[PDB]
Coordinates of C-alpha atoms in Angstrom, one line a residue:
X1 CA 85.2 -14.2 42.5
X2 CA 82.0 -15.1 44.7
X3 CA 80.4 -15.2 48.3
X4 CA 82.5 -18.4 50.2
X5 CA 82.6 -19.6 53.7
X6 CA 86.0 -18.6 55.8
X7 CA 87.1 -18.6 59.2
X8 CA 84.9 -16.2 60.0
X9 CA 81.8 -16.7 57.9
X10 CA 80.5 -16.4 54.6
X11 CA 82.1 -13.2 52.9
X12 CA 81.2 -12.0 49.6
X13 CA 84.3 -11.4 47.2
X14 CA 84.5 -8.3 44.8
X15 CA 86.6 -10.8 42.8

């Protein structure tokens, strides 16, 4: 996918 925000921070997604 790509790097998003969450409810912890930004991660960046392998998918």
């Amino acid at each position: 996918g790509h790097c998003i925000p969450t409810t912890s921070g930004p991660i960046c997604l392998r998918d």
